[PDB]
């Protein structure tokens, strides 16, 4: 019957629009708003034949800040943090290979050592020779290695709840791992809210339709993310022997109630760094630059002012 088929067309039309098209445009609209408010726009560049997506803003005449997201995250983690920075800095935030909109070759290495070399190659690819680095979690682990390996390029380093040391207190993540639980890998749609609860003390407001799509995207990425996470475990590079090689002023910034990586990490790193600064934000979780962006950016600007002003 023509009507049964016609009705079949509309039913699929509405379903395809509801299930696929509306969520995607929703994400594109929110990205448009948050990137636009931060003065950031998206580009891509091929680095060792991998497509690396990145955001860029501010004047190229100003010093470059290169921002590196953590495990399972992407460059949009940095939008609200970057907003007060693009007035005075050339801000760049990339998607690491394996994440976001960048290439994800199935057979590549995604250890932080290999990733740190890709980031250095990326900086050269966009014509940046001297820069400030900031990295969160896995991205901080990577940023620290970049700074240790290429001291001539790095003007300052900000480690925002970075991975890479073994502190006195075992974090809730590392506790979870002993029982085969990893909140950072979202297997089921309900585990996405669990991930947010795990990394935020006070979670920023998130519209329900946007949240569900983010959760769907996280589930779709979970198998590959789990494989990368296994490489981060098996190909782990301790920072303790590397930190003394860093010449740059280094900011250690933590959320005091970080459940993923413990604040006692700072006591490991501080004695090992030539020029450490410290900020511990109160009642804050693992991603201060997302949870309290303007506050975190203000601490970072203060740090940068000191680095420049003397
Ligand atoms: C919880 C993890 C971080 C969430 C980031 C929220 C991104 C979208 O957040 C929404 O954006 C709107 C316009 O930009 C705001 O006006 C809304 O209040 C906010 O819910
Ligand atoms: C512009 C809309 C993008 C929405 C961003 C949602 C925030 C993602 C939460 C992940 C936080 C980082 C987790 C980690 O570093 O381990």
Author numbering: 1 to 310
What text appears in the publication on this structure?
PlaF is an important virulence factor, as the P. aeruginosa ΔplaF mutant showed strongly attenuated virulence in Galleria mellonella and macrophages. PlaF, purified with n-octyl-β-D-glucoside (OG) showed PLA1 but no PLA2 activity toward the artificial substrates specific to each of these two phospholipase families and the natural phospholipid diacyl phosphatidylglycerol containing pentanoic and oleic acid at the sn-1 and sn-2 positions, respectively. PlaF dimerization, mediated solely through the intermolecular interactions of TM and juxtamembrane regions, inhibits its activity.
To gain insights into the PlaF structure, we crystallized the OG-solubilized PlaF protein purified from P. aeruginosa membranes. The structure was refined at a resolution of up to 2.0 Å. Active site cavities of both the monomers reveal non-covalently bound ligands—myristic acid (MYR), OG, and isopropyl alcohol (IPA) in PlaFA; and undecyclic acid (11A), OG, and IPA in PlaFB. These FAs are the natural ligands from the homologous organism P. aeruginosa that were co-purified with PlaF, as confirmed by gas chromatography-mass spectrometric (GC-MS) analysis of organic solvent extracts of purified PlaF. The N-terminal 38 amino acids form a long, kinked helix that comprises the putative TM (αTM1) and the JM (αJM1) helices, connecting the catalytic domain with the membrane. The TM-JM helices adopt a coiled-coil-like conformation, where the αTM1 crosses its counterpart at V14 to form an elongated X-shaped dimer interface with the buried surface area of 656 Å2 per monomer. The catalytic domain of PlaF adopts a canonical α/β-hydrolase fold with three α-helices forming a distinct lid-like domain that covers the active site. Finally, the H-bond interaction of catalytic S137 with the carboxyl group of MYR completes an intricate ligand-mediated interaction network bridging the catalytic (S137) and dimerization (V33) sites in PlaF.
